[PDB]
């Protein structure tokens, strides 16, 4: 038995200088510590080189993170795609709590058979969900549009209000909703921005916004991370 | 499979702070140590060190965590900066520029050259009998790569010298009386680990020690 729930955080790949690296954002790791009450360890994006079942057995929960990169149908990460898309299905079937953020939310939809808009802002009837360019983190990650919780699902069960404001840092978004996914929230332009996996044995939630950001200061972000954290505690037991 | 923690470094990438770990170390952990590599965030006091140590079977240290792991009997392998930090953590010192000491060679890699050239063996390495490297079966002399501008100056109390470069630089150390495998090397044995029997022997010893703990 462990001191804390061990929460795996998906890495991305990146070339830095002459070397390939696996990377994960500081804000996701601190949100795990401070919002979920877990110990964050970073899962390498090695695809089939790591034994997936050994990996799943080692964690109490999985945070599928946001990324500048995009699931493959310009900035891509096939190395991540090959780790996270079997993994997220494998974790949910194992009863391992899963929280998907931004790219990870899009990956949950894709893994269950759905599709994405590659450019939400070029569909014609959505708003522009991208962050404002050339500005600091505090401005880019501040709340920018409303979010309408659909009743009877995970988000309403955790106690979120019917409407609240969220940040938005995404050029892609959900088009066809995968079968077996419950819609948890819609942006004001009808875009699906949160989903849950129907019948999942454990917590299985994805959101398009970035609740890791300054998590303790936003009660809606914090409630998401605390519910995720509780589910990771439950699994450890 | 033992869960082997690989230390991350912090790096600013555009707007955001990231925690990063080299692909080659992670693959060496998989292929050479037979472990499951998980990357340990460089969060310092923000994480609980004792919870961190309990969650791993071993620690690969690159670039007081290393001290606490050793005191706890968690196997440790230090590489390059990780070997240097092992020395400092026990009270030793470093040369900031080995190539400007005057009686060492230049231990840096050739600049503006591809990885294959930079990480190929470049100088000899002389094992000091009777320690960890002897005991895992390494020959008395073998060739190693060399990608370092710093190196060990004063050896910390409580460390055994394991090997010397041909200019006398201490390039490997172990921790006397450690409950578990506790080895630091200045060179880069993760590099194409399966193809070099001396690098592989080190990684297999490390992995066997991590499996022990995993029991
Ligand atoms: Mg949005
Ligand atoms: Mg050298």
């Amino acid at each position: 038995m462990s001191r804390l729930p061990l929460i795996g955080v998906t890495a991305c790949t990146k070339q830095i200088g002459l070397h390939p690296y696996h990377i994960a954002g500081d804000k996701y790791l601190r949100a795990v510590v401070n919002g979920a009450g877990g110990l964050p360890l970073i899962i390498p994006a090695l695809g089939e080189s790591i034994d997936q079942a050994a990996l799943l057995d080692s964690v109490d929960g999985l945070l599928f993170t946001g990324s500048p990169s995009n699931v493959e149908p310009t900035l891509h990460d096939s190395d991540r795609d090959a780790t996270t898309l079997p993994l997220v299905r494998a974790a949910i079937d194992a009863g391992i709590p899963v929280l998907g953020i931004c790219r990870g939310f899009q990956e949950m939809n894709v893994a269950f058979g759905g599709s994405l808009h590659q450019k939400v802002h070029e569909v014609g009837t959505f708003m522009d969900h991208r962050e404002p360019a050339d500005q600091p983190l505090e401005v880019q990650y501040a709340p920018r549009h409303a979010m309408h919780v659909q009743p009877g699902g995970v988000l309403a069960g955790i106690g979120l209000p019917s409407e609240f404001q969220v940040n938005s840092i995404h050029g892609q978004g959900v088009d066809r909703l995968a079968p077996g996914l419950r819609v948890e929230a819609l942006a004001p332009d009808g875009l699906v921005e949160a989903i849950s996996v129907e019948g999942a044995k454990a917590f299985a939630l994805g959101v398009q916004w970035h609740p890791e950001w300054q998590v303790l200061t936003n009660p809606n972000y914090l409630a998401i991370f605390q519910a995720f954290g509780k589910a990771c505690s439950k699994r450890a037991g």
Side-chain angles (χ1 to χ4, degrees), chain A residues 95-119:
Chain A
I96 290 159
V98 167
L99 174 63
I101 292 175
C102 192
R103 194 233 181 100
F105 154 85
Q106 292 162 3
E107 282 170 352
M108 292 175 56
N109 192 55
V110 169
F112 280 90
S115 71
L116 307 177
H117 296 293
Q118 305 298 325
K119 294 184 183 151

Side-chain angles (χ1 to χ4, degrees), chain A residues 70-73 76 118:
Chain A
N70 300 286
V71 193
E72 282 197 289
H76 289 286
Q118 305 298 325

Side-chain angles (χ1 to χ4, degrees), chain A residues 148-217:
Chain A
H148 295 100
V149 173
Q150 308 297 289
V154 177
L155 290 185
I158 59 167
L160 301 190
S162 61
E163 173 185 322
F164 61 89
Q165 299 303 118
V166 297
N167 48 25
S168 201
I169 307 97
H170 57 109
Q172 313 211 332
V174 170
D175 179 5
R176 169 183 77 254
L177 176 72
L181 300 187
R182 177 182 193 100
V183 183
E184 293 283 344
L186 300 175
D189 61 3
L191 183 74
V192 174
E193 284 219 12
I195 58 94
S196 61
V197 179
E198 289 179 327
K201 305 198 308 242
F203 183 99
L205 178 70
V207 304
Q208 177 69 87
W209 64 93
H210 279 263
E212 84 281 5
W213 180 251
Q214 303 196 343
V215 57
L216 292 177
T217 81

Side-chain angles (χ1 to χ4, degrees), chain A residues 44-74 76-150:
Chain A
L46 287 175
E48 283 207 332
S49 318
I50 274 173
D51 176 66
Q52 177 162 284
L55 174 64
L56 294 174
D57 173 70
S58 82
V59 298
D60 296 306
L62 285 174
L63 183 67
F64 284 81
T65 58
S67 188
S69 46
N70 300 286
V71 193
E72 282 197 289
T74 206
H76 289 286
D77 193 338
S78 58
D79 284 339
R80 169 161 173 168
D81 280 333
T83 312
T84 61
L85 287 162
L87 189 67
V88 76
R89 300 287 322 247
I92 289 162
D93 293 329
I96 290 159
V98 167
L99 174 63
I101 292 175
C102 192
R103 194 233 181 100
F105 154 85
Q106 292 162 3
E107 282 170 352
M108 292 175 56
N109 192 55
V110 169
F112 280 90
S115 71
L116 307 177
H117 296 293
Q118 305 298 325
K119 294 184 183 151
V120 167
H121 47 284
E122 292 190 10
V123 170
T125 45
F126 293 123
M127 60 181 89
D128 192 343
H129 286 255
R130 294 174 295 181
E131 77 275 30
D134 303 308
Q135 304 264 159
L137 290 192
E138 283 84 2
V139 171
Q140 286 188 337
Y141 283 78
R144 194 160 192 109
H145 66 65
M147 184 52 46
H148 295 100
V149 173
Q150 308 297 289

